[PDB]
Design a binder for this molecule. Structure first.
Ligand SMILES: [Zn+2]
Ligand SMILES: [Zn+2]
Ligand SMILES: [Zn+2]
Lengths: 128, 117, 59, 62, 185, 36, 67, 104, 151
């Protein structure tokens, strides 16, 4: 149709989301409490095997066997199909070879700022 | 006694019919399509079990232990694996009058032992 | 006559047809092939003797 | 059939509703529509045949 | 054909399409797929006959079925959160279809009921001094749903002789009332 | 016909028509004391 | 379709109580307490108010024949 | 800071993976065309939390009430994979599990 | 009565039940179970009948012969009893089941259509369906006998 209206309509949401809100859409009876403002790569896990890519699932604050998840590629023919594992050492830990399991968009409280970081390709790993 | 199975020719794969060789006075199994013959090894040509004394344990399959609608019991442990639980069921098969008899099957996976009390 | 014969009442045909004839008309002439298609467990002579009259009637 | 004759399977129950189907408005109107569309295509065949036999075009709307 | 002995046949709408080696986890996969509203739609019936190794799948029309509550080990999948979202049905547009899509409810046809072990009420799922079943798979939403439109008007129909309930179900249809609101036109 | 087929035929016949005891057309008989 | 004038059983007037009954119900009365406030003490008149379905309100959703 | 802020928007509400910038936006799209332009104009976001517990989407004058379904079938570890380190420097933020379905 | 039927079932399951002359083992088991349950129905009906006072109006109408019978009183007060289809207990219309609510091969009284409630107590859903089956039998009989009897 036209761009001089699209520029202002896209900025219009960027401006209206920051106004004062005190009412619902269907029945304006519910008062708001707070607001949650908004590449990526997520390793899916199988619910039976129950996969521990992080130390959270292991119920751990930090890595008791590492200090940096150096997510490095499995090979040269697999950029999206890397090999994520929590091993700072060349130790034969759980080698979770994140196969290519090729919208699931992710965001965060980035200091109450307007951005996005939608995911690129749902990979899923197993115990190799 | 036991039943007798059908046996097929080695050339035309048709069923071999019984025949008698007077020259040797011996049973043969010969095809009426090709000209094949074979020396029998059972000597029995027909068997009718009028009493129908069939072991229904052979008709049961262990997979029936996966049926949620069958009753389970802990009172009859398995003699082959020692599992406590076991499904039980009646014959429910025609030509079996005394069919209140119970047949048991072990619910342990990959055991599948079947028996009767 | 001797045993129990299996027949098949096909559509548009006003006469019973032996099952073995139907199997052969579909390209399965060898009795082994027909019973491979009918009897899946060759360790069971009961099924075998009960199908045998149909074979004996179609030779 | 042999399993039934050997007693290894139960005869099927004519009354079991698992063995039945309910012919509703849609599948019934479909039976009508098949018959009626076939009759329509037939009538179109006769009408178009009597024209092309004369070696000239015809109007499908008629 | 030698493989058909131990294998399980698979029929789809009456057509024998193939065979399988582990029917149990096939049925688990297919039930998971139907309960997730994946490729299998809700009205598809999937019966595993175990003693005879058929697995019959039906998608054709005319199969009368009814909804039932799926049951976990010995628990309903209908948790209190579903009832909570159903209470505010008119605000959050959480409807019946969300209940079916959650894998909490399932449509079971007459032929798949043969393979189902029903609980008349969740009270049947309680552990008892002598357990009747302890391996239920579904539960009634309410037994009174076995009645139709005209029998659902009888009060206390389980305290009448059944012919009386039939005669009322016939006589509710000759009863006067307001057959429709726009009767003036 | 060959001998074996003849044996099978007479087997199937004897097992049906050979009346060892009793009167034909009478399938079952129950003996009892009438209380009435 | 509309609240009857009299109670069918005794003949007590209930026609003037439907609107008051509804007003009491929106005033967070229970149906029993509302029926007590209107003076319907016999269960026949309580039947009249408690089992009434105001269908006239639905018949008034249709435009009349003449404007 | 580290809280789950995962949402799953349908096809007709696909928001841009990057902030709106005039050097990354262009005019290419036009009842038939009315659903077409709404992909790159209405689609930055503020997920409001109400008092009843539910959330809603605010991308303009229209409000889409969302429901934060919490799924135990897709427990993928969501991470900001930016091309910088060895192979996509996945930063550990929040594991995706709960998916919020927006709709009119 | 239900414990008695359970005992007969246990006997049959253990092959500790031998058939009586003139019947197969299934028919003998059915006879034993039906005898137990008929005895239960009659005993409960007698209990209800003796419980009645001289002011009871059911008893008044039954005594005068105006309407009703002692079996009706028993079904209203004590127990409705066994529901029969074609003179037998409720058939296994499912696969070795009367309803999907029962286990397979359950010849117990409640599985096969014994209504252990009265009409005042109220029937359970399975008792309700089995009673509807038994009543449907009477409706069919009433509607089908007429043509043959009139002819
Ligand atoms: Zn040969
Ligand atoms: Zn075992
Ligand atoms: Zn009154």
């Amino acid at each position: 149709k036209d761009r001089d209206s699209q520029i202002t309509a896209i900025e219009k949401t960027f401006e209206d989301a920051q106004k004062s809100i005190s009412q619902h859409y269907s029945k304006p009876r519910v008062t708001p409490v707070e607001v949650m403002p908004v590449s990526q790569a997520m390793i899916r896990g199988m619910m039976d095997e129950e996969g521990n890519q992080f130390v959270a699932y292991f119920l751990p604050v930090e890595e008791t066997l590492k200090k940096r998840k150096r997510d490095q590629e499995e090979e040269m023919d697999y950029a999206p199909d890397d090999v994520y594992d929590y091993k700072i050492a060349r130790e034969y830990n759980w080698n979770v070879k994140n196969k290519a399991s090729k919208f699931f968009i992710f965001r965060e409280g980035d200091g109450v700022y307007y951005n996005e970081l939608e995911t690129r390709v749902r990979l899923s790993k197993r115990r190799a | 006694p036991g039943f007798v199975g059908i046996r097929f020719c080695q050339e035309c794969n048709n069923m071999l019919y019984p025949k008698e060789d007077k020259e040797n006075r011996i049973l043969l199994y010969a095809c009426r399509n090709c000209d094949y013959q074979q020396e029998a090894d059972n000597s029995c040509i027909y068997v009718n079990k009028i009493t129908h004394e069939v072991d229904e344990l052979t008709q049961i399959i262990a997979d029936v232990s996966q049926d949620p609608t069958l009753p389970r019991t802990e009172d009859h442990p398995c003699q082959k694996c020692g599992h406590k639980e076991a499904v039980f069921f009646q014959s429910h098969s025609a030509r079996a009058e005394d069919a209140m008899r119970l047949y048991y099957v072990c619910t342990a996976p990959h055991c599948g032992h079947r028996w009767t009390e | 006559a001797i045993g129990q014969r299996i027949v098949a009442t096909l559509p548009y045909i006003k006469q019973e047809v032996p099952i073995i004839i139907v199997f052969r008309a579909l390209g399965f002439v060898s009795d082994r092939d027909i019973l491979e298609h009918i009897i899946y467990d060759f360790e069971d002579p009961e099924m075998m003797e009960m199908v045998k009259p149909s074979l004996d009637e179609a030779f | 059939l042999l399993l039934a004759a050997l007693g290894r399977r139960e005869l099927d129950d004519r009354d079991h509703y698992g063995n039945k189907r309910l012919d509703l408005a849609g599948p019934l109107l479909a039976f009508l529509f098949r018959g009626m569309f076939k009759n329509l295509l037939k009538e179109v065949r006769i009408y178009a045949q009597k024209f092309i036999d004369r070696g000239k075009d015809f109007n499908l709307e008629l | 054909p030698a493989a058909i002995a131990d294998a399980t046949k698979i029929f789809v709408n009456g057509c024998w399409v193939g065979i399988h080696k582990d029917p149990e986890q096939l049925m688990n996969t297919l039930r998971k797929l139907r309960r997730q509203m994946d490729i299998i739609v809700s009205e598809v019936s999937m019966i595993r006959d175990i003693r005879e190794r058929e697995i019959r799948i039906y998608t054709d029309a005319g199969r009368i079925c009814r909804p039932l509550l799926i049951v976990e080990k010995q628990k309903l999948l209908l948790k209190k959160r579903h009832i909570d979202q159903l209470k505010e049905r008119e605000y959050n547009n959480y409807s019946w279809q969300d209940l079916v899509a959650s894998g909490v409810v399932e449509y079971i046809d007459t032929l798949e009921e043969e393979t189902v072990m029903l609980a008349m009420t969740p009270d049947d799922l309680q552990e008892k001094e002598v357990a009747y079943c302890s391996t239920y798979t579904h539960c009634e939403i309410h037994p009174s749903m076995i009645l139709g439109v005209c029998a659902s008007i009888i009060p206390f129909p389980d305290h009448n002789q059944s012919p009386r309930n039939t005669y009322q179900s016939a006589m509710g249809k000759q009863a006067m009332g307001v057959y429709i609101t726009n009767f003036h036109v | 016909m060959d001998d074996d087929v003849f044996l099978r035929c007479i087997e199937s016949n004897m097992l049906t028509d050979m009346t060892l005891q009793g009167i034909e057309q009478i399938s079952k008989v129950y003996m009892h004391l009438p209380q009435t | 379709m509309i609240i009857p004038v009299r109670c069918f059983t005794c003949g007590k007037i209930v026609g003037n109580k439907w609107e008051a009954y509804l007003g009491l119900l929106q005033a967070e009365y229970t149906e029993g307490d509302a029926l007590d406030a209107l003076g319907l003490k016999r269960y026949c008149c309580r039947r009249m108010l408690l089992a009434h379905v105001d269908l006239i309100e639905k018949l008034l959703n249709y435009a009349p024949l003449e404007k | 800071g580290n809280d789950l802020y995962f949402v799953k928007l349908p096809n007709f509400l696909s928001v841009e993976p990057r902030p709106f910038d005039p050097q990354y936006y262009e005019d290419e799209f036009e009842e038939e065309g009315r659903t077409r332009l709404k992909l790159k104009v209405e689609n930055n976001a503020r997920i409001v939390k109400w008092s009843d517990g539910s959330m809603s989407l605010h991308l303009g004058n229209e409000v889409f009430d969302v429901y934060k379904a919490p799924l135990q079938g897709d427990h993928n570890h969501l991470f900001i994979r930016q091309g910088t380190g060895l192979q996509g420097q996945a930063v550990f933020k929040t594991k995706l599990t709960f998916r919020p379905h927006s709709t009119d | 009565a239900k414990q008695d039927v359970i005992e007969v079932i246990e006997k049959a399951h253990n092959n500790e039940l031998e058939p009586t002359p003139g019947n197969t083992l299934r028919q003998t088991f059915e006879n034993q179970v039906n005898r137990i349950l008929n005895d239960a129905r009659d005993k409960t009906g007698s209990s209800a009948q003796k419980s009645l006072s001289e002011y009871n109006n059911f008893k008044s109408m039954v005594v005068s012969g105006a309407k009703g019978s002692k079996i009706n009183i028993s079904q209203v007060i004590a127990v409705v009893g066994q529901q029969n289809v074609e003179g037998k207990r409720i058939p296994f219309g499912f696969k070795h089941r009367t309803l999907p609510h029962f286990i397979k091969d359950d010849y117990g009284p409640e599985s096969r259509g014994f209504v252990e409630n009265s009409y005042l107590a109220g029937l359970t859903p399975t008792e309700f369906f089995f009673h509807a089956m038994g009543g449907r039998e009477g409706l069919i009989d009433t509607a089908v006998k007429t043509a043959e009897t009139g002819y």
